[PDB]
Amino acid sequence: QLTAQQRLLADQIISIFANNTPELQYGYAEVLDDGRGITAGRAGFTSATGDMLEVIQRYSRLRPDNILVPFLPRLQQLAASEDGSIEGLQGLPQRWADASQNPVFRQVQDDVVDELYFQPAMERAAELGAQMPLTLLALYDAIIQHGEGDDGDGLPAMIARTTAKVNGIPAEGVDERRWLKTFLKIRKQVLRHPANLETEDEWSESTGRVDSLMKLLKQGNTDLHPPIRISTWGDVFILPIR
Numbered sequence: 148q149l150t151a152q153q154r155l156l157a158d159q160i161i162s163i164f165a166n167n168t169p170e171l172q173y174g175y176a177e178v179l180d181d182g183r184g185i186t187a188g189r190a191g192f193t194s195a196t197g198d199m200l201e202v203i204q205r206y207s208r209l210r211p212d213n214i215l216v217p218f219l220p221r222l223q224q225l226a227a228s229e230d231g232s233i234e235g236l237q238g239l240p241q242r243w244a245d246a247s248q249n250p251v252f253r254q255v256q257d258d259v260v261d262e263l264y265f266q267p268a269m270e271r272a273a274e275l276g277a278q279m280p281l282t283l284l285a286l287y288d289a290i291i292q293h294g295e296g297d298d299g300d301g302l303p304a305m306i307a308r309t310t311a312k313v314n315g316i317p318a319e320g321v322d323e324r325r326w327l328k329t330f331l332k333i334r335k336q337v338l339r340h341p342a343n344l345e346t347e348d349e350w351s352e353s354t355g356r357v358d359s360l361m362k363l364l365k366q367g368n369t370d371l372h373p374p375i376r377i378s379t380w381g382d383v384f385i386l387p388i389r
């Protein structure tokens with residue numbers, strides 16, 4: 148689906164979207180007051196949503212005695228109810244940062260990203276018949292921020308509403324640029340007006356990333372060819388960085 152240069156490009160763009168830097172933030176760990184508890188890692192794994200749990204569980208099967216093991220009971224409870232409480236995760240941010248110095252922990256983050264976000268987003272693209280690299284990037288960025296749940300803010304509902312609006316999918320002959328433009332506008336509307344009010348401030352301030360994908364679409368860079376200029380947060384980045 149994506150070239151090696153296109154995937155590194157996608158990762159550096161989404162990294163800029165989320166953290167204003169093309170360097171993947173494996174060691175990032177923060178409370179954002181968005182209802183999700185602690186948000187951590189290169190894809191923003193989260194205490195409330197179960198993806199932070201999967202990372203630590205998989206890592207603990209590779210390395211039973213790690214500094215993150217004591218949080219497994221609590222994370223288990225938090226994931227089971229989608230709870231945003233950060234008790235008692237005291238010390239978890241620092242331990243996540245330290246664990247991220249181990250390439251094997253970073254590798255687990257890569258595997259989870261691939262399993263939860265990249266491969267499902269590419270499977271969605273294939274079902275849609277989507278073939279422009281820009282559409283793949285837009286689906287991949289959206290799956291990371293919105294998730295693949297069944298809520299009206301999730302990627303699957305956004306795709307469904309895009310297809311309803313334009314009367315079909317690209318594999319059915321709807322021009323893919325039209326489908327993509329509709330998807331980006333629907334995505335910006337969801338970020339501005341989410342059904343989950345706890346993420347409203349967080350998501351509302353993140354709409355420049357949809358603007359950046361729209362800018363690439365309007366400039367005809369649907370194939371993600373270099374150089375790519377991203378300046379979502381004011382700072383200008385030319386990608387790929389070498």
Ligand SMILES: N[C@@H]1[C@@H](O)[C@H](O[C@@H]2O[C@H](CO)[C@@H](O[C@@H]3O[C@H](CO)[C@@H](O)[C@H](O)[C@H]3N)[C@H](O)[C@H]2N)[C@@H](CO)O[C@H]1O
Nearest residue numbers: 190191192193196197198263291292293294295296297
């Ligand atoms: N990092 C979060 C992101 O986790 C979150 O959303 C969640 O994403 C999950 C992974 O896509 C997802 O779960 C899956 O749900 C499908 C339902 O079809 C199950 O079949 C899979 O087995 C699940 N793994 C969650 O439902 C989804 N909410 C996102 C927004 O809440 O926040 C990101 O920052």
